[PDB]
C-alpha cells in the first residue's frame, strides 16, 4: 500500500492535460490505494 492517490501526492506535474501524469503512475497510484 501507499497513500497519495487519497490525496494525489506522487501526480501532479501536468494538470490541464490531466491524462499525461502517465499510465504507470496514475496505475501505481491506484495500486498503492489497494489497502
Known amino acids: ?3 497519495p ?3 494525489t501526492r506522487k501526480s ?3 494538470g ?3 491524462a499525461f501524469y ?3 503512475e496514475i496505475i501505481g497510484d ?5 489497502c
Not at 30 to 34: C, D, F, L, T
Open 1 to 3: 500500500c501507499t497513500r
Open 5 to 7: 492517490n487519497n490525496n
Open 12 to 14: 501532479i506535474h501536468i
Open 16 to 18: 490541464p492535460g490531466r
Open 22 to 24: 502517465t499510465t504507470g
Open 30 to 34: 491506484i495500486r498503492q490505494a489497494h
